[PDB]
């Protein structure tokens, strides 16, 4: 029993970091990276079952080539990510949603405001974020990959939603 999920959003919102935190338990400050993967994975327990979650980073690519389309193909859940400190990343969300729906249909999706550890100097107000989440009909999480807040919860919610 495997579940494929795509992580979707503008550059530098924390997508690859989110995947690395969830699958490996690590957060790297320096970002000095070397090797390419198409997905990471990890086992999760849901409704007394051993689910294999495979997380693909769609890397902010707006026009989908054959590789990008393969990233989206067979996606069973979607994480839409914006950054606390990047207003354009928040504004791009409704467009990203349309691209995801056009590509794969109406799969379980969550909206994530990442970098919430930096909330004291946020580019976006909670009321705006909740307002967008309501408009798009999406459960909203405020997340810190850096501090491991509301990362596991997002993927668990989506996995449960798919297996309901
Ligand atoms: N303060 C803070 N920084 C973060 C968080 N998540 C990611 N970052 C940083 O934001 C930068 C971009 O992250 P990255 O995962 O590469 O973004 P991506 O382009 O969406 O894959 C990196 O320097 C990360 O360390 C977070 O929760 N809090
Ligand atoms: Mg990336």
What is the SS3 string spanning 2-56? Answer: EEEEEEECCCCCCHHHHHHHHHHCCCCCCCCCCCCCCEEEEEEECCCCEEEEEEE
Residue nearest atom 2 in ligand 1 by C-alpha distance: 115
Helix (H) or strand (E) holding 81: strand 77-83
The experimental method, as deposited, was X-ray
Residue ranges at the known binding site: 12-17, 30-31, 33-34, 57, 60, 114-115, 117, 144-146
Nearest in space to 157 (alpha carbons), one of 136, 144, 138: 138
Nearest CA to ligand 1 atom 6: 14
Contact between 106 and 75 (Cβ < 8 Å): no
Residue 85: DSSP 8-state: T
CA angle centred on 138, ends 133 and 142, rounded to 5°: 65
Q: Could you give the CA distance from residue 104 to residue 75 in angstroms, rounded to a whole number?
A: 7
Cα–chain-centroid distance for residue 131?
19
Residue 69 phi/psi, 5-degree rounding, is: -60, -35
Q: Whose CA is nearest to atom 1 of ligand 1?
A: 115
CA–CA dist 99, 12 (Å, integer):
19
Ligand 1 close to Cβ of residue 26 (< 6 A): no
The reply to whether ligand 1 has any atom less than 6 angstroms from the CB of 76 is no
Please give the CATH number for the structural domain made up of 1-164: 3.40.50.300
From the alpha carbon of 20, which atom of ligand 1 is closest?
15
Residues forming a β-bridge with 140:
111
Residue 136's Cβ-count burial label (10 Å; 0-12, 13-18, 19+) is middle
Is the C-beta atom of 109 inside 6 A of ligand 1? Answer: no
Enumerate the domain spans of the chain. Answer: 1-164
Question: How deeply is 115 buried, as exposed, middle or buried, from its count of CB atoms within 10 A (0-12, 13-18, 19+)?
Answer: buried
Three-class SS state of 139: strand
What is the whole-number distance in angstroms between the Cα of residue 39 and the centre of ligand 2? Answer: 11
């Amino acid at each position: 029993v495997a579940i494929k999920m795509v992580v979707v959003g503008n550059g530098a919102v924390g997508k690859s970091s989110m995947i690395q935190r969830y699958c490996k338990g690590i957060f790297t400050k320096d970002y000095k990276k070397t090797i390419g993967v198409d997905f990471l994975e990890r086992q999760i327990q849901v409704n007394d079952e051993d689910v294999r979650l495979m997380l693909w980073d769609t890397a902010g690519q707006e026009e989908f080539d054959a590789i990008t389309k393969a990233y989206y193909r067979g996606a069973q859940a979607c994480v839409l990510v914006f950054s606390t400190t990047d207003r354009e990343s928040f504004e791009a969300i409704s467009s990203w949603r349309e691209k995801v729906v056009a590509e794969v249909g109406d799969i379980p999706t969550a909206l994530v405001q990442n970098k919430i550890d930096l909330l004291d100097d946020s580019c976006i107000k909670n009321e705006e974020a909740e307002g967008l989440a309501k408009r798009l009909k999406l459960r909203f999480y405020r997340t810190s990959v850096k501090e491991d807040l509301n990362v596991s919860e997002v993927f668990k919610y989506l996995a449960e939603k798919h297996l309901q």
